[PDB]
Amino acid sequence: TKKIDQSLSKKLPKGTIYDPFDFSMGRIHLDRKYQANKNSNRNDIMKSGANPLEFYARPRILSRYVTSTGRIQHRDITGLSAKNQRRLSKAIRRCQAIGLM
Amino acid sequence: TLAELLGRSRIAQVANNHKPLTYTGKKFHPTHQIIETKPSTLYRQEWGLKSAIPSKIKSRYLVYNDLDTLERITTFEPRGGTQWNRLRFQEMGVPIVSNIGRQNPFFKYISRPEDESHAKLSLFKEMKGDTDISPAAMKKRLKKITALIRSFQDEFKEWLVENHPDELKLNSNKLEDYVVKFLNKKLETKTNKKFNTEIIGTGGLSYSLPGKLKNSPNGVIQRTVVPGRILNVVKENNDNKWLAAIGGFVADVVFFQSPPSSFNSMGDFIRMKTFLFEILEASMEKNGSVSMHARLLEPQ
Amino acid sequence: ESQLLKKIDKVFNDETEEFTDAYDVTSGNTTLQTQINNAIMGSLSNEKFFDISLVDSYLNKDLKNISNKIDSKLN
Amino acid sequence: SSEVQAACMTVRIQNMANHIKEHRKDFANTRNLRILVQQRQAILRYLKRDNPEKYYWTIQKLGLNDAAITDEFNMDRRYMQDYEFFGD
Amino acid sequence: MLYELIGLVRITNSNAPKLEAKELSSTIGKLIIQNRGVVRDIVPMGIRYLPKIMKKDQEKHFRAYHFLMLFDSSAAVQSEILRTLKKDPRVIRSSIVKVDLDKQLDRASSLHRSLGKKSILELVNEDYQSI
Amino acid sequence: AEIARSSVENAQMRFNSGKSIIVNKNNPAESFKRLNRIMFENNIPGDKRSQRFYMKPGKVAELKRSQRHRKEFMMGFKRLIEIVKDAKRKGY
Amino acid sequence: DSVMRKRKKKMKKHKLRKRRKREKAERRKLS
Amino acid sequence: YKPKEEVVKYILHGKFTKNNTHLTFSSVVEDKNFHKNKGLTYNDTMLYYLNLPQKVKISLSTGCLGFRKAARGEYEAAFQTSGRMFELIKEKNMLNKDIEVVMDDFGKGRAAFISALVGKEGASVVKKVVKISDATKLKFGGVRSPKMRRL
Amino acid sequence: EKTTLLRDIRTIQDALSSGSTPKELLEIKQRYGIQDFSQETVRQLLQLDISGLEVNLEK
RNA sequence: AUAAUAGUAAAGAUGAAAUAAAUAAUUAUAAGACUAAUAUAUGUGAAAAUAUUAAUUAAAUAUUAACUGACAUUGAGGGAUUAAAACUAGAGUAGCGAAACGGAUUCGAUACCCGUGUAGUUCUAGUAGUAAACUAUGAAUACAAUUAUUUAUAUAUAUAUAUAUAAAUAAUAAAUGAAAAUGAAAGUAUUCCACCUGAAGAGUACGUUAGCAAUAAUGAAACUCAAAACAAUAGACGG
Ligand SMILES: [K+]
Ligand SMILES: [K+]
Ligand SMILES: [K+]
Ligand SMILES: [K+]
Ligand SMILES: [K+]
Ligand SMILES: [K+]
Ligand SMILES: [K+]
Ligand SMILES: [Mg+2]
Ligand SMILES: [Mg+2]
Ligand SMILES: [Mg+2]
Ligand SMILES: [Mg+2]
Ligand SMILES: [Mg+2]
Ligand SMILES: [Mg+2]
Ligand SMILES: [Mg+2]
Ligand SMILES: [Mg+2]
Ligand SMILES: [Mg+2]
Ligand SMILES: [Mg+2]
Ligand SMILES: [Mg+2]
Ligand SMILES: [Mg+2]
Ligand SMILES: [Mg+2]
Ligand SMILES: [Mg+2]
Ligand SMILES: [Mg+2]
Ligand SMILES: [Mg+2]
Ligand SMILES: [Mg+2]
């Protein structure tokens, strides 16, 4: 067979430097273990400094912090500060009461 | 005094670094200072750090973050492999060239205001170059600056009525120009980001000047041939070039006309074989990466 | 009521655009440039939305004692 | 100055009393009102000791009398009934 | 006090989707300006599908015209507006939230503040100085 | 009319509940596995069982406190095991 | 005091409550 | 103008409780002339097509297959009841249009029904099933449940 | 008095720029006491106390 | 719960059972109570309490500036508030559920489990002032060695971290302690209040006060005994 699963091969980006270890399975496993959604902050409005309570009439943004059934995600999952989690949950509950979410 | 000596000590010479020792993102340049110990000191676990490195370590190169921690260990990784990437680049003898034809950053050139005609582009870059700034510390750039700029109102309420009164009575299209120049002229004396942290040129990867020819017993070398590896068996998606792994760098390989038949045959194991490449040019991007362009020299 | 009828027509008109919040539309500086100009120029500013400097210079005989000064210089 | 503090407290007492008359079950704010009235008594008691002339002038202008200041006051249920705080 | 009304009007006629919304905004706006109030802005939000099928006055709805109305009035007038909205068969859902004016007199609608435009002056100055 | 006929597809799926899967005609047992994952990530089976019998508020509060402690305790345990493994790798 | 000791007070309270219920009943018939 | 009742899809509903399993097969009937009626608004038309009427065709419990008392709520009772349903759907020529499966609760018959439909017993019905969903009814507060049993 | 400051200050600035002297001005010379209608009389009708405070503070 | 619809013959319950055109499914209508995720009761509140949304009114934070000039602390008596249950009126009554009447279990079963389910649980206006009303730890002030983690304010810049000062929490030094342990107090000190003086009798009796009432507060003595209690230790035992 001339095919390998993507999970068993690492694609080295262009312009990056590499070591021989980057072709091993240890690199594959190490990349899975340390795979965190750290790029969310730059794409996370609520981790930017905006007040989540100003989005109570924008269900599309709020729908990014609820599960498929509408259950607000725990702070352990959203990664927000206590204040933003508190404000975001209020926004979602207000949005639900208005008839938008 | 002891404080003076400490400031000049070899440990002080290493700049503070808390960057992750285990980083799984894109690596474009070295992030940690390589520490080396001599064989005699390695035999005694001596590295010039606070504590002895565990005897299990057989490498003579490491990178560290903290001399000591609350866990009573040193935070270190026994690797020094970014030095071999630099030395392999030196062996390829390809000077780094500017794709924009800019002045050489390692020479003290006499520059002029040719690019200074964008005073309003960069004077406001100080407040507009805030891509990743706090929502309130960036807002402190609005009141703190406003007061500083508002303290020059009297100076600009007299200079403008003494050097360009016509514009004040005709149009503000030129007044705005006199404003951008005024602040810069009154800011060049100031020190706003007087130290620039941007990478300077190659960043230290190569100090080789373009122009020199490589003499060899078989005559002057006209094309540099370097062994490499093809990573993918299908060109980079959306790009007309494949990717190769040459000397610790990932390059874009351009083929003469066709792709060798070993590609289809090998498939996803194409990286298992070594091909010969020719390094066309090497460029440096602002992210601090090296843009190496190669050519898959095939036996013919 | 006259202003109300004009506003309703101008906002609920087919030509008018409505905030449907279906996509992250793309494009601060504008409002930051008006501030910078009103801080440096002050009374002698060209911004439509000026600061209290202009109203202060008026009641302090500055915008008038400078207009005459400039005109006298032109003479 | 104690006279100014008493006057400033008087304004808040008048406002808070109006609130209580419309929210007779708001015990949290009734407690706040009681404490504020007792605070005003305390400041005026000091004023009587410090500057008696100002003291008598101040209480006359505020509509109070010496008894209202010196006597122990708890704003209890009997007070609400003897002065018809809530009306009927 | 500054208030922000968000109303979900019924779209009875598919040919005139923005008809009851215009008639309703005029009714609400007239109440505000005839009782010492000021209407600061009227931001239409367009036809949107309701998150579920909703009911009102023995009728069912699956879509509504969304509109926002930022207005200044007294508390008594604000309650009168809310009472009229809760009774009008056209209105499916209505919410009035106070916008604090303690720190600044000119606040934009939450929709605009969410986009970084904190005051109506910032919105107007971006339509004159740059448009 | 046809306007109410050609706009029913989105409308039908616009009022989704989030507890539905489009079956993969090839592997139909993989779609039931996906649905089960939704149930567990929204705690549907747990909530249903917890709603069968009434629990006093004090008991509810006790159980919520203990569960949180065990969750946090496990996170602290894993952090210490990671340090152990890292320390072992470096020869400590 | 421990549960063991609390149980002695519990028994005394139960017997007092039992006696007062008994007395109440009598008053009802005798009334 | 004329009743034109037609089947659009079938709903296979399963209620899996602790003591029994109920399986209902239904048809989503659509009068294809509803839009041809007079005095019909765009809202009424869209509201009629968003909740189409349903007609029950097959109704089964575990007691219809002879399982009695405590055996009704077991895995084997559900597996056989699921088979009988998948058979009655083929014996009634109701395997022409797409089927939507709706599961309600998490008793012991929920995993038996799934096994009987992804296996040999449901190799004909599974080919028509287009959408699976869960319809477990939860309460946000709501009525007070009975007291905990002391056993 | 339906007359408003803005309107009155718009007549003292139009009459002073057009030459018209309707009796309204004489009345306006009594409503405000401004007998003389010049550009340096409207500036003294619209003076704000804040301006005086700003100079006392500098002293 | 009621009605409609097709569709049927069992359904429901339990350890297993049995007591009382259905169950299930899709619609429509009505009613009462409750408040899923977020969530940590984090935080807030004097305590009791407090987490679906909005509004009105009231109260609540930090720093700075100015001001008052010891105006403070504590607090007998007193006052106010005070879970659940309970009671007095008028409404409400879906679900739950003392009692009662039945079904089971058992040698018996005035129980644990099941059914029917009254008071009650709900709202309005009141009475009453009790809980393991608990941190089983009164309030205030001065002070003492560290670390970690959050939070807040401030400062800086080569702009995102760094440096400061407080608060909270966790683990500790010292100290204290019968020990378990406490840890900024259960430490070093000062001030004020409440309370205790062997067990049992007893928070009982009698009287008194208060309450529509249940009761609440106050609160003994005789007789009898040489006991009685706490922390910790080693065992034995544990369905
Ligand atoms: K708390
Ligand atoms: K003094
Ligand atoms: K005292
Ligand atoms: K007392
Ligand atoms: K009831
Ligand atoms: K407790
Ligand atoms: K005390
Ligand atoms: Mg006091
Ligand atoms: Mg004790
Ligand atoms: Mg069973
Ligand atoms: Mg029951
Ligand atoms: Mg039914
Ligand atoms: Mg909740
Ligand atoms: Mg707490
Ligand atoms: Mg006190
Ligand atoms: Mg009653
Ligand atoms: Mg019972
Ligand atoms: Mg009471
Ligand atoms: Mg008692
Ligand atoms: Mg007590
Ligand atoms: Mg309690
Ligand atoms: Mg105090
Ligand atoms: Mg008693
Ligand atoms: Mg013990």
PDB file of N, CA, C and O in Angstrom, chain H residues 2 10-11 32 45-46 52 65 76 92 95 98 115 118 124 149:
ATOM      1  N   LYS H   2     -59.203  19.772  -3.314  1.00  0.00           N
ATOM      2  CA  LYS H   2     -59.551  18.364  -3.204  1.00  0.00           C
ATOM      3  C   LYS H   2     -58.576  17.721  -2.221  1.00  0.00           C
ATOM      4  O   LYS H   2     -57.355  17.922  -2.349  1.00  0.00           O
ATOM      5  N   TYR H  10     -42.019   8.433   7.025  1.00  0.00           N
ATOM      6  CA  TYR H  10     -42.489   7.644   8.151  1.00  0.00           C
ATOM      7  C   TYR H  10     -41.645   7.953   9.380  1.00  0.00           C
ATOM      8  O   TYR H  10     -40.440   8.200   9.279  1.00  0.00           O
ATOM      9  N   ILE H  11     -42.292   7.941  10.542  1.00  0.00           N
ATOM     10  CA  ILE H  11     -41.632   8.174  11.821  1.00  0.00           C
ATOM     11  C   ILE H  11     -41.684   6.882  12.625  1.00  0.00           C
ATOM     12  O   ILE H  11     -42.771   6.387  12.949  1.00  0.00           O
ATOM     13  N   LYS H  32     -51.585  17.341  -0.569  1.00  0.00           N
ATOM     14  CA  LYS H  32     -50.834  18.102  -1.561  1.00  0.00           C
ATOM     15  C   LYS H  32     -51.667  19.185  -2.237  1.00  0.00           C
ATOM     16  O   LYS H  32     -51.140  19.901  -3.096  1.00  0.00           O
ATOM     17  N   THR H  45     -49.845  28.493   5.466  1.00  0.00           N
ATOM     18  CA  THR H  45     -49.234  27.491   4.599  1.00  0.00           C
ATOM     19  C   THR H  45     -47.902  27.025   5.171  1.00  0.00           C
ATOM     20  O   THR H  45     -47.631  25.821   5.241  1.00  0.00           O
ATOM     21  N   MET H  46     -47.056  27.969   5.589  1.00  0.00           N
ATOM     22  CA  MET H  46     -45.775  27.599   6.177  1.00  0.00           C
ATOM     23  C   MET H  46     -45.961  26.868   7.500  1.00  0.00           C
ATOM     24  O   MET H  46     -45.170  25.977   7.831  1.00  0.00           O
ATOM     25  N   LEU H  52     -46.518  18.706   9.870  1.00  0.00           N
ATOM     26  CA  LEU H  52     -47.463  17.957   9.058  1.00  0.00           C
ATOM     27  C   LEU H  52     -48.185  16.912   9.910  1.00  0.00           C
ATOM     28  O   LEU H  52     -47.585  16.334  10.821  1.00  0.00           O
ATOM     29  N   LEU H  65     -45.835  -9.452  22.092  1.00  0.00           N
ATOM     30  CA  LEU H  65     -45.061 -10.620  21.700  1.00  0.00           C
ATOM     31  C   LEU H  65     -45.051 -11.699  22.778  1.00  0.00           C
ATOM     32  O   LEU H  65     -44.256 -12.641  22.691  1.00  0.00           O
ATOM     33  N   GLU H  76     -33.944  -8.761  26.008  1.00  0.00           N
ATOM     34  CA  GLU H  76     -34.420  -9.723  25.016  1.00  0.00           C
ATOM     35  C   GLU H  76     -35.823  -9.374  24.539  1.00  0.00           C
ATOM     36  O   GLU H  76     -36.143  -9.542  23.356  1.00  0.00           O
ATOM     37  N   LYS H  92     -46.398  -4.651   5.267  1.00  0.00           N
ATOM     38  CA  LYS H  92     -47.436  -3.664   4.999  1.00  0.00           C
ATOM     39  C   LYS H  92     -47.051  -2.728   3.862  1.00  0.00           C
ATOM     40  O   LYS H  92     -47.762  -1.745   3.614  1.00  0.00           O
ATOM     41  N   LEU H  95     -42.184   0.472   3.218  1.00  0.00           N
ATOM     42  CA  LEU H  95     -40.739   0.634   3.122  1.00  0.00           C
ATOM     43  C   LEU H  95     -40.343   1.305   1.811  1.00  0.00           C
ATOM     44  O   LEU H  95     -39.258   1.060   1.280  1.00  0.00           O
ATOM     45  N   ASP H  98     -38.754   7.459   2.982  1.00  0.00           N
ATOM     46  CA  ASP H  98     -37.722   7.583   4.003  1.00  0.00           C
ATOM     47  C   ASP H  98     -38.325   7.518   5.403  1.00  0.00           C
ATOM     48  O   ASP H  98     -39.436   7.997   5.643  1.00  0.00           O
ATOM     49  N   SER H 115     -29.482  -2.294  18.214  1.00  0.00           N
ATOM     50  CA  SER H 115     -28.820  -3.498  17.728  1.00  0.00           C
ATOM     51  C   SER H 115     -29.672  -4.213  16.686  1.00  0.00           C
ATOM     52  O   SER H 115     -29.141  -4.762  15.715  1.00  0.00           O
ATOM     53  N   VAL H 118     -29.333  -2.113  13.293  1.00  0.00           N
ATOM     54  CA  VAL H 118     -28.026  -2.152  12.650  1.00  0.00           C
ATOM     55  C   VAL H 118     -27.576  -3.585  12.384  1.00  0.00           C
ATOM     56  O   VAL H 118     -26.418  -3.810  12.020  1.00  0.00           O
ATOM     57  N   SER H 124     -33.440  -4.274   6.030  1.00  0.00           N
ATOM     58  CA  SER H 124     -34.329  -3.632   5.071  1.00  0.00           C
ATOM     59  C   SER H 124     -34.732  -2.235   5.533  1.00  0.00           C
ATOM     60  O   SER H 124     -34.741  -1.292   4.737  1.00  0.00           O
ATOM     61  N   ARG H 149     -36.654   6.511  47.491  1.00  0.00           N
ATOM     62  CA  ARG H 149     -37.068   5.257  48.103  1.00  0.00           C
ATOM     63  C   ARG H 149     -35.976   4.749  49.039  1.00  0.00           C
ATOM     64  O   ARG H 149     -34.802   4.682  48.665  1.00  0.00           O
TER      65      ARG H 149
END
